[PDB]
Design a protein around this ligand. Structure first.
Ligand SMILES: [Fe+3]
Ligand SMILES: [Fe+3]
Ligand SMILES: [O-]
Ligand SMILES: [O-]
Ligand SMILES: [Zn+2]
Ligand SMILES: [Zn+2]
Lengths: 323, 323
């Protein structure tokens, strides 16, 4: 029925066409320390975030899920500024990143006191049911993340807390999987702790090119997200070409009602601006919010993927997920 | 001659009695994510920070070095608020924490770009010679930190950049050593890259109880800091009793002109307030800024440590270090 967005409750019925995973802002933990050479430019950042939204609106998108981790520069008030001037619905997350590129020293310390898993649960329930800080904005999803080849002890605290919060709230869980690993493990651990698979999206599933691995995750009844379209060359990634092959195989095998598509873009980088080195730069040049609609979809159509299938992925699935 | 404080340049001559290592604020990276349940209380925090200063002033202290890492919630403007209302001199740092409990993902990413060591140097030179963000405050020291048993590849970028900045600036280096390790290694690596040992303080040297280890560091001509007084039970610590034995041995062996004393207090914790379990809580109850003057010094006096020796440690050495 309802979902909390950065502008308050919105019926699921009106989410319409949705990108299930994009970042308006994102910073790697430690960006804070680089303030002198990388201060946040409040207003140009907004110009840039607004323009990003207006772009997706040109392709029909009405709703964006932004699962930027709490420890990766999540800024719900800024999201709200984007939404109050675009009419775009934006649903944000509560959750921390994977141990690998998240900021684990804080909750690792609290684990030493013996309160971390409870404190995490409390944070989830606060941000889902009351508000994030003093913004009045509620997260609509819980973001979970795990490392390569392993859901670490640290990560597991968040997984258990999330299953806990979901049972209390029915909030949707969206995950990050690292380098094409732990998809089935994540599904199984969440389900072992009473999470509802119809309210779970295992993310970055396109990172793997073994259809066995995908079907192994699908068996749990969760959603899977091909949400990294355009990221190529960099950080143990497949190519968009491989993503398309893998995707086509699953659609022709009848899995459309469990698949969602996105880019995982980062539209404004927190901290010091940078330029990618040329090998990576050219491979990554298709990493923008227009990419699915201008490059990917047309390829799938020319593969015979029918309009109703596309609409199940972009409209029907997000509706089903949040309702 | 001169040193930058949070209130601007101050002649070294007037630093007077000094604690070389304390934190008014400190947060473990990730504290940022706990904002909903852990927001920074701007004005009570200041009441608390001001009161902390007023305390140290009752024991003669005129100057405090606060080497809170950039990635551990360093806030120079807040320091300046403390100083403009206490008359206390506060000298702050530019530097990042050790890989273990700092926030390495940001500069690890830039290392992948090939620019991290140069970007770090640039940050040091900016904060030493121009200003931290838009506060106008210059760091007076460079903070370095290393892990247990290892100066990691990540940490080394900061060590090299620092030696580089020191050569350009003559800024003082203050280090953190983890669990009584890497003291001689740190000294040797900095010196190998052209740092001046008369402008280096190897910190947390009290973490080790082998006087061989101490003398092995001292041979480089650097300062060493017994800066953790009051911290026991936790995180590999020795007891204040062991600290005193180790300290006494070095003073009676004539090393007073290379030693400085402090508590490494955290007076306001960033993020969610907390309490500690009984076992650790009582072996930590002496972890306050009055501890040196009310407990430690009296013990050393009753050991025959003469007033002139105490004055060399608290007054003479800091003067020598910064001049
Ligand atoms: Fe993401
Ligand atoms: Fe410290
Ligand atoms: O991501
Ligand atoms: O410390
Ligand atoms: Zn991710
Ligand atoms: Zn330290």
């Amino acid at each position: 029925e309802m979902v909390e967005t950065v502008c308050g409750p919105v019926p699921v019925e009106q989410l319409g066409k949705t990108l299930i995973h994009e970042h308006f802002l994102f910073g790697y933990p430690g960006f804070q320390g680089d303030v002198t050479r990388g201060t946040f430019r409040e207003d140009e950042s907004l110009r840039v975030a607004v323009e990003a939204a207006e772009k997706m609106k040109r392709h029909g998108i009405q709703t964006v899920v932004d699962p930027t981790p709490n420890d990766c520069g999540r800024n719900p008030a800024f999201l709200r500024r984007v939404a109050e001037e675009t009419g775009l619905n934006i649903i944000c997350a509560t959750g921390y990143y994977y141990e690998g590129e998240g900021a684990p020293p804080y909750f690792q310390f609290r684990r030493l006191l013996g309160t971390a898993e409870d404190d995490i649960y409390d944070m989830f329930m606060a941000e889902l049911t009351e508000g994030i800080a003093d913004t009045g904005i509620k997260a609509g999803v819980i973001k979970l993340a795990s490392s390569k080849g392993r859901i670490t002890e640290y990560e597991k605290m968040f997984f258990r807390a999330a299953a806990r919060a979901q049972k209390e709230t029915g909030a949707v869980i969206i995950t990050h999987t690292q380098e094409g690993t732990m998809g089935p493990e994540q599904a199984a651990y969440l389900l072992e702790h009473g999470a509802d698979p119809k309210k779970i999206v295992i993310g970055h599933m396109c990172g793997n090119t073994d259809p066995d691995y995908h079907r192994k995750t699908l068996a749990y009844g969760v959603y899977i997200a091909f949400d990294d379209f355009g990221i190529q060359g960099m950080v143990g990634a497949p190519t968009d070409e491989e993503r398309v092959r893998t995707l086509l195989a699953l659609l022709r095998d009848g899995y459309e009602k469990q698949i969602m598509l996105s880019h995982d873009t980062v539209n404004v980088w927190l901290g010091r601006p940078f330029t990618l080195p040329e090998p990576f730069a050219e491979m990554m040049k298709n990493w923008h919010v227009e990419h699915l609609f201008v490059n990917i979809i047309p390829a799938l159509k020319n593969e015979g993927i029918r309009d109703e299938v596309l609409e199940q992925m972009f409209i029907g699935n997000p509706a089903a997920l949040f309702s």
